[PDB]
Write an enzyme that holds these catalytic residues in place. Structure first.
Site, PDB file in Angstrom:
ATOM      1  N   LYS A  14      14.202   0.700  -9.703  1.00 45.51           N
ATOM      2  CA  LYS A  14      13.966  -0.575  -9.026  1.00 45.51           C
ATOM      3  C   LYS A  14      14.411  -0.422  -7.568  1.00 45.51           C
ATOM      4  O   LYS A  14      15.584  -0.122  -7.336  1.00 45.51           O
ATOM      5  CB  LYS A  14      14.767  -1.675  -9.733  1.00 45.51           C
ATOM      6  N   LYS A  62       9.743  -0.743 -10.407  1.00 43.99           N
ATOM      7  CA  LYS A  62       9.568  -1.994  -9.674  1.00 43.99           C
ATOM      8  C   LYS A  62       9.939  -1.872  -8.205  1.00 43.99           C
ATOM      9  O   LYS A  62      10.984  -1.269  -7.956  1.00 43.99           O
ATOM     10  CB  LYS A  62      10.616  -2.982 -10.279  1.00 43.99           C
TER      11      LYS A  62
END
Ligand code: MG
Ligand code: MG
Ligand code: MG
Lengths: 320, 326, 320, 326, 320, 326
Positions: free
Chosen positions: F196, F251
């Site tokens: 992420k 992400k």
């Protein structure tokens, strides 16, 4: 992965014959064997070879008698090596393409009597030249290549005309595989296979063979990457099968060649390998089980087929 | 071809030397030696022409020339007296056993020569197997490890720089490493016989060491590897590296060159190979008969380097070192 | 795998010389060395080169004297670099193919006196042009390529005629390897080898060489993938051996080239690399053991052969 | 082509034999057998033409010919009496259960024949699931492992050389290995059913073993693998190898040949495949109808070797061994 | 990596349908299906095939009626197999390129009525020769290849003229893909695709097909590496798509072919595979869910498209 | 070319469908939802056109259509009241917090719908950071894990089938797995936000959840990944798999498709990707302006499947499911 003792004990599969058989990774069968044979010119004769105990030079009538048993044992093919009489050796090597030369006569006899047996002939000029070099020389002793390629092509075509299913440029030269491939196609012999001696080393293991047949280009034993380039070139030129020679001393090469190209790969257990093993077996130093151990090594290493003077013995043993 | 003619680099000696991919040097050689009890003893071995069994005094004399030739290490194999063989293999860890005595003598006389002792119970058992037998005749794994660990500690106490477990029991490398670490033998190397096959090429060695009559027609298929298997050797070597081996070995040698190549490629670790007694004998018999030229010795040893070995245990080590010194 | 301290202590093999020797992965030998030499035009002369301490320009009679010791040490080959007199430099570069040019005279002398010593000649037009550009220019100063390819082919053929066993297009151009390869074959010089300067970088390390010889196409030092494309093209054009240059500053390139192609790979430890090392050794800043350390790096990195001005010293040291 | 015509090697039988890449031998065959309680019982299974359920006395008689043909091992599947099925599956570890009794009888009569017992609770549960159900009808993982471990110990006590957990509970291979090691069953092999899919090809087996009516329309999607997944099989096999399996298996067989190939290539470990009941039935039905020649049997088994399997559990084992003996 | 129970429990994603759907790696869709059809010569007729329960030979008017439903279900293409009347079989195989042969008439009818439906025709001479061999024979019974290549080219061109978008040399020969590719380009049919039967095995699974159509070159089932060489040659000759046949018994080959070449890969679930499954389903031995299980195996194994006699049933099921 | 014209397969729709390499289905979709406190509340989010914050009663009504469209799961994000934010983030594990209450309501009403709860302290801290701050303003790693573990246990107690730690603390996946196992939550899946990045594409989400004003101009560079790094993502995912994650996620999404591809290729594990708020907003703004056709929605989601994702968290899930239902 992450296999660790004692969760993983590799002896468990070795505990019993049944589990050793279930996990056994390779097996030698008679389908893997090719028997080389030394063929004499006359009638009703055999000769013993001092440095290859148990191997005999055979006249063609004797060859036909022994082939009955090789065929009954299931051996798929023979590799013929004529023993040229010295009075047939010349400068022009015309005997290489004589339709009445030993190789041509032997192949017509065998193809007629045993139609399913494969015959692999030797394409090379050394057994037919007075000097013993694999090529026709000019006035100073240097190889004239197209004169030599020309006779080799006549030689391969003469083998194809006699019925040979496979021709084996046993030389270690460049240009021959393509010229032979091209000439066979050109002449209508579209299914004759070419078994190239691709990675063939300059080796001391060929000693006994020179006794058997009456006799800058072979690879340096130190080199391995070079063998892959040799096999790639033969494949590109149209070889149907590729071979490593000698054999057991080069098993790492067999493994690399099979892994790299995934093509039909053959290996020659040469005269010296046979002689070392047989001398030790006859002296009581090694059990005869070493013959099958040596041949299963070729299968484990990646060979599809093995040219071996022990083919008959091995086929007989494959029964147990 | 014609652009690429591989014969061009082969044409001349200088270009063959420039492109030569591998070389054999004396740094790669380990000489195995058979050691007798007693004094002033030297015995020929008919199935290993040119090799002799030597008492320790004779071994020290011969080792002066092995050291002068630069051979890095010896691998010791004791010729145990018949009367010292037993079911418990207790002579394996006797501080006064032949291997222990030979090690102390060599470490004192030649401080830089590597001494590789054999960890295995076959020279010490009445039955010739490499471990202890249960009542069904099976070679017990963990009970055998207990004796091998005592043996390896005794070799470290005698001064060996390397112990080499040639037994093929599962897990013994980790057991021996733990015992060496616990005892403070921090730098004793363990040369594992990792992928060791159940082979017919060991015949002459059984004669040399005196285990032949004890083993009789016995086999080691429940522990040594099946010759048909290649992938399995990678699993054997992986375990021995995880267990702490400093070097891993393939045995026999020439019949298993494909295994040496896969092991070096897969693990990139110090890889050794044993050119066993039967390989030595078959070559020697053919050379003495005039069937093979003497140049086959270096050709055979060059193959091990080409196949990926760093070091080679070979009975030809003295001859090869003499020939390389040129 | 799963090697972990203290089960695995990597210092155990380093404990003693014997175990460091047994696990030692690479070794430099005299078989790996090629010595570059600067050759003068006259008789009985030598000149010192200010930026290459210890290296000398040698007339051919002096070259023959020094070569006796290079051959006794076992050095396999020399790479010749003529020092062209300014009055021989022209616009048409005819001196490149003069059968009486320094390179041709030096190679005939050496091939006659030391028949087994390999000679690698430099195929390039820069040492022979007044402007110093590697090619013949048109009226505006732009390279005319086939006029230039033509003289280079005459140059390579003149080298082959003088007896050179290897020619080295030291240029960084496209079309030359194939034209030379094609011309040599065409003319009957089938065994002359072509050592291509395949991955040759635009570098500051060539400084001292310009002093030694009296003097858009070289690769950007930032690029690595580009070197693999350069070597692939030379291989496809028929090179027998491929080289990376400069050397130590590009050892990662040597490693990638050997790994990718598995072909005979050479590396040049250039004039600036030699000069840096020798200046530091002479100043007492570095021990002379750095010479062998630098050369064993090339072997570890994957080179088969090394062009090095330290060849004589290294061959002398290889004894210890 | 024209230089490379792949038809050249295909032209003749001798050259096809020389280049043939894989071969099927009797060493590769495992025969699954359905065992009944009682004496002198033999029952046909309509959905598995040619296969019979056999009482132990009849199994011993038929096994004389399986042994004579050289089949290495049998895989036993007990046909549990309806009244011995329960929620706790306690019959799974009864020392007097059918599997335990059959194992002792076969180990005594044919000492070299491998006996592979099934570790799974489906023959013993009223619901037909392979583990114990919770109150929501879910197959509990760890509570099921406890019963499977008791079952596997009982099989080892009966003398089985191999136990094969076919249950698809997570972690059971390591639990069973730990229990076998702790109990001293050092050499009992564990043949894990590693990548076993939730398939429709198992229909006929449920009839053969008598679990069909117990399972009804039930499914095993919370434990057997989704047929769509391939990468997941590599994770299943990796765990089972790390947990101590001696052999790993893919099941079903022909519909999952791609999985056999990936598993052998990735792990290089002893790899087995099950040619399940539905594969047997579909072939047998087509052969009996005259739609497929009998040569399809060997063709189907050759595919498993080509795909990378070392051994094959197949209801065609006797027929295949008879045909290979030629 | 290092995933270990109980930190890693692979049953967690299998606990619920929603998480099984989220991690589901492959899915079969109607875009993957090709339906083979047996086409009769007459009008208003259908015939049942004893060894392929549920499959029918269809006259062209009946074919058009059934195709309305195949198109409504979204099946992308059909593979046509004409059932040649015995009086149309000859020695010269002229019926193969007759513009009024069943295949040509069927393809013109379908291309006109359903312009977006793909039609894959069968290029082979066996359905049209009296002897049933795939080639024209000389006096002794041996294949004359250019006479045969000639008729095959006329055949492929006749298919292209009738509107076929794809031609499928279903033969297992060498030279045909290139000749057809070359002829199509030469004649202006630049977008006709060639779907080669690349790895086609000598198999017992084709039994029922011989009943359906009224009838040394196919691959040995033992070989896997050989299939990669077969696919490579077809790709080099210009195939647009490559196929493995039979199917389920060769799923490992599908996986290797997709992985090696990353090209559009097709697989034929042959007549015997269909017959085995349908017989077992009709006998109540296997649930009908095995049809989708067998077809999802082809997608998991790496196939882009599947030739299957279950296409209609599968397309109907793809809804659930 | 001419032999190989890649335009041939492209010529017609039928051949494009036959060779099409990847497909998007509703099985691949996860819809993130912003949940409000209170009753009968629905709020528009200006920076996420078309997305609304919903009270639980409104969420249950809208979920009837999400379930009818076949969307497999929702990802819940609570819009915490300003007054419940604190330094200790204690509201994260309140059994009566919005996430816990929404989970119980959805699990009861729609038993087959997957509920993925967010494990992270950013909705609950006054400062907006994903963990607890020390006195130097640093986000403490292990003290934060202690609160995240309490949070994840509370979600499991509420009935969530999946908890998804989106926090980027080192080691939290293993801590949470250990706590779930110890508490008997055997089958609760952990969907790790593994790779992420510290991105600017999260702007609109901070508005949607109400953390924007708390975070102010703050950054998360000491824990979220540097956008320049690719090899580092492989190390993040490897650790999370070893620690027990059932699924791993990359992400943001479209700006990191290269990372999705490397992660699927390297680990062959269930791989998820989040098409974040800023990706949704930029597409929606362009579609509403008439700059991009609506077909860009499916094109964007098809890219995630082509890149190697198994599942996609996307605010377009309802629209995409409606369009796929054709
Ligand atoms: Mg071991
Ligand atoms: Mg599992
Ligand atoms: Mg992390």
């Amino acid at each position: 992965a992450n296999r660790a003792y004692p969760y993983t004990r590799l002896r468990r599969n070795r505990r019993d014959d049944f589990s050793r058989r279930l996990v056994r990774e390779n097996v030698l069968t008679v389908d893997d064997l090719i028997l080389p044979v030394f063929v004499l010119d006359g009638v009703n004769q055999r000769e013993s070879i001092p440095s290859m105990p148990g191997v005999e030079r055979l006249s063609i009538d004797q060859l036909l008698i022994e082939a009955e048993e090789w065929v009954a044992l299931g051996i798929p093919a023979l590799a013929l090596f004529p023993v040229t009489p010295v009075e047939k050796k010349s400068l022009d090597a015309a005997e290489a393409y004589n339709p009445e030369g030993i190789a041509q006569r032997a192949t017509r006899a065998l193809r007629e009597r045993f139609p399913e047996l494969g015959i692999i002939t030797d394409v090379a000029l050394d057994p037919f030249t007075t000097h013993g070099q694999d090529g026709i020389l000019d006035d100073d002793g240097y190889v004239l290549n197209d004169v030599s390629i020309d006779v080799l092509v006549r030689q391969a075509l003469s083998h194809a005309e006699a019925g040979a299913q496979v021709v084996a440029p046993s030389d270690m030269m460049d240009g021959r595989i393509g010229a032979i491939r091209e000439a066979l196609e050109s002449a209508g012999h579209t299914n004759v296979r070419i078994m190239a001696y691709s990675a063939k080393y300059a080796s001391a293991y060929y000693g006994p063979f020179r006794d058997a047949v009456g006799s800058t280009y072979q690879m340096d034993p130190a080199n391995s990457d070079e063998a892959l380039h040799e096999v790639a070139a033969d494949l590109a030129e149209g070889a149907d099968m590729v071979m490593v020679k000698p054999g057991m001393p080069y098993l790492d090469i067999v493994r690399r060649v099979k892994d790299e190209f995934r093509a039909p790969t053959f290996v020659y257990q040469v005269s010296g390998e046979y002689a070392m093993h047989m001398g030790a077996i006859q002296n009581g130093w090694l059990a005869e089980s070493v013959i099958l151990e040596s041949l299963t090594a070729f299968k484990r290493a990646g060979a599809d087929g093995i040219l071996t003077y022990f083919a008959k013995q091995a086929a007989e043993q494959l029964r147990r």
